A paper describes a structure:
For example, the VFIT mutant from the Closed Library contains Val, Phe, Ile, and Thr residues at positions 35, 37, 43, and 64, respectively. To determine if these differences in the temperature dependence of exchange could be observed in the crystal state, we also solved the maleate-free structures of WT, HEX, and VFIT at 303 K, and calculated isomorphous difference density maps by subtracting electron density at 278 K. Comparing VFIT data obtained at 278 K and 303 K results in substantial difference density throughout chain A, the chain that opens when WT crystals are soaked to remove maleate. By contrast, similar comparisons for WT and HEX showed relatively little difference density. This analysis confirms that VFIT undergoes larger local conformational changes than either HEX or WT when the temperature of the crystal is increased to 303 K, in agreement with our van’t Hoff analysis of NMR data.
E. coli aspartate aminotransferase (AAT) is a pyridoxal phosphate (PLP)-dependent enzyme that catalyses the reversible transamination of l-aspartate with α-ketoglutarate, yielding oxaloacetate and l-glutamate. During its catalytic cycle, AAT undergoes hinge movement to switch between an open conformation, in the ligand-free form, and a closed conformation upon association with substrates or inhibitors. Using our approach, we enrich the less populated but catalytically active closed conformation in order to increase catalytic efficiency (kcat/KM) with the non-native substrate l-phenylalanine, leading to altered substrate selectivity. Steady-state kinetics reveal kcat/KM increases of up to 100-fold towards this aromatic amino acid, resulting in a selectivity switch of up to 1900-fold, and structural analyses by room-temperature X-ray crystallography and multitemperature nuclear magnetic resonance (NMR) spectroscopy confirm that the conformational landscape is remodeled to favor the target state.
Author numbering:
A (entry chain A), B (entry chain B): 0 to 396
The structure:
């Protein structure tokens, strides 16, 4: 038997949680686990701009014939404008090529396979903590993953001194991964000035920067959230950007992402991009059309784009109000520990500072589900579940 | 500079040809390369069943939240019934687990990654000739690819004796890849007795069968086309099926496929399937929903399924009329070679027998695009383009 010697795989630290949640029969459960946006009703809605775009596609699509390996051309162009700016020199010099991929995960995997097979890259540096699936994606391509320090769990801030020192041994030709904004899971991003410091250090040490952009528009705005990347783009010959539209378009299950390659000149990037397409061909051949067609339609239509931007602002602002309400209700419910750092953190997630033991208590005694690392999805909080949630947390403090 | 010394990849023998066709400006160009279905009009249509299912989805979808790693459950259930039949013992014994994948290609890569990372398998056997991308997929997962004989070019038939003497070099624990029906590119499939011979030889030699099922329904029928797979399934304890809905549903660019895992018992397949989900998680996380939702909606609704089964029947029969028309028209245009063997070949493709130089001549001089191996897409032939097509072929004989 070929399958007899197989060892079972552990449950995913995030998706295994959602399986335990679907089984729990207790009334009043609260899901603060997976990173999806809930509305004030506690539901995960389809955006109006997306429904409008899907109607246009239903009426106007005449064929489902294969896309090119790199996907919808307009999708790649609108992606580069979103990341680098409408009039970026990167775009005018034709230094960037973008492949449409199945979600942000697929973009990271395409980059990993491309690097492992066509470059001397052997090592990727990832923040500690980070998205748990980062290590698995790069390991799947045979790349060693090291960790650099990031979070000051005492002051609930960026430990910039430890970050610099821990990256001292990152060699020229190593890949260093940066969260573009809304760091997962800490919600603490570098300031513009810290970005500029990292950009200078990156060029001096010869790192290959890889930016993971899964939450553009959830911190401050579409343009502001990209300031760090554009500070790097102004100084580097080469970099890679894995972006995702799962969160900011609410297109999670349609798998809409992009992997953007940047090189010194158009001739080099075209040569490298041909090898990236070869790695896509051997993986999934060509990308799924529906989700990317939606995004390209919205971003190309000025009227639909204005709808989406307002819907994104509504999502970002509801999350910020839930942060404030979360802190206030914890006080009202009698918490003596100070949770005001929550209001400083950006995006969907925040390191609550709860121990694995307290997270386990919340899940089994109170039906409140969070990731074992203490990460809670603030976007899962509503005016209706806020008080029971806070009463449960205060109970385990 | 990390990208400066990368070597450009060669063009894909199929998709590179498609790019040349799009760029060609002559109005009379004929595309017989990529495996997509054309109607008598010369367009690549969307099936009516698909359009109706998409309209249902547009009006009833309330969320785009992530699917499970293995995708839509009903999709997996309906896939297993198509492959093994309604009352299969594999299904009742719970020996089979299916993961929804991005296309058939994605199913192949998932299986390859799963095998290379969790088993001792190191060698995959693929027919000569075969789909060109088979080698790329398995090599990229780190598996060695060996070739066994299949096609008798002299008699334009299956060389069942060479096939066997070749596969005797295949050891136990090796993976042997079989086209379930409509062999690509030859269109010559084993008979039911030859399948049963290979099945017995397979269990006797200890091979792990891997079936590529991209054209179920294009040879004889949905059930008839699965006879070979069901002969293997009745004897083996383990096998893998990579299937695609790109062709038989015309959902090429939505990437709808499945990877079905079979083990000796329910406990072993679940253990093995857990590692397959891990390989998926580190690739694209979870599969695209739109295409698989369409498939599951059509197969779950009796009215829609009846429409789809008739649309698939019309596709299969139009291709059969073009095979007849193609052979007769060649005689009328002055071909002295005998092309009767084309009538005995199944599916969309036919091994024309033209040389690489003749194929090159057809493209450059006559604007007729075929794969360099001489494979032509019969489904690209229409009554309108038949006469110019055959006139060009006769002119290079
Ligand atoms: C930092 C980061 N990268 C990538 C992803 C995955 O994105 P996607 O669901 O589009 O594959 C996520 C969220 O799941 C994330 O937080
Ligand atoms: C034999 C065979 N296997 C797999 C595939 C992959 O199909 P898909 O487009 O679903 O990836 C194809 C054609 O594309 C094929 O002909």
């Amino acid at each position: 038997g070929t399958f007899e010697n197989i060892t079972a795989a552990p449950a995913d630290p995030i998706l295994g949680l959602a399986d335990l949640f679907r089984a729990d029969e207790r009334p009043g459960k609260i899901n603060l686990g997976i990173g999806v946006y809930f509305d004030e009703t506690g539901k995960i809605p389809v955006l109006t701009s997306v429904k409008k775009a899907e109607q246009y596609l239903l009426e106007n699509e005449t064929t489902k014939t294969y896309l090119g390996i790199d996907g919808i051309p307009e999708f790649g162009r609108c992606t580069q404008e979103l990341l680098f700016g409408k009039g970026s020199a990167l775009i005018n010099d034709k230094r960037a090529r973008t492949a449409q991929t199945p979600g942000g995960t697929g973009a990271l995997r395409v980059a990993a396979d491309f690097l492992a097979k066509n470059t001397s890259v052997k090592r990727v540096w990832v923040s500690n903590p980070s998205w748990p699936n980062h290590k698995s994606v790069f390991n799947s391509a045979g790349l060693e993953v090291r960790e650099y320090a990031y979070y000051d769990a005492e002051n609930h801030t960026l430990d910039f001194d430890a970050l610099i020192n821990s990256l001292n041994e990152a060699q020229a030709g190593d890949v260093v991964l940066f969260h573009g904004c809304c760091h997962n899971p800490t919600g603490i991003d570098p300031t513009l000035e810290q970005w500029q410091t990292l950009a200078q250090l990156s060029v001096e040490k010869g790192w290959l920067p890889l930016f993971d952009f899964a939450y553009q528009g959830f911190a401050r705005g579409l343009e502001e959230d990209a300031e760090g990347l554009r500070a790097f783009a102004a100084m580097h010959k080469e970099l890679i950007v894995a972006s995702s539209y799962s969160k900011n378009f609410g297109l999670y299950n349609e798998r809409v992402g992009a992997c953007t390659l940047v090189a010194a000149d158009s001739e080099t990037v075209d040569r490298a991009f041909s090898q990236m397409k070869a790695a896509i061909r051997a993986n999934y051949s060509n990308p799924p059309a529906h989700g990317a067609s939606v995004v390209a339609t919205i971003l190309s239509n000025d009227a639909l784009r204005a709808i989406w931007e307002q819907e994104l602002t509504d999502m970002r602002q509801r999350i910020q109000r839930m942060r404030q309400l979360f802190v206030n209700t914890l006080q009202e419910k009698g918490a003596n520990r100070d949770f005001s750092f929550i209001i400083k953190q950006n995006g969907m997630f925040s390191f609550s500072g709860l121990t694995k033991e307290q997270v386990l208590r919340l899940r089994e005694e109170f039906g409140v589900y969070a990731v074992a690392s203490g990460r809670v999805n603030v976007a899962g909080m509503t005016p209706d579940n806020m008080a029971p949630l806070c009463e449960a947390i205060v109970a385990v403090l």
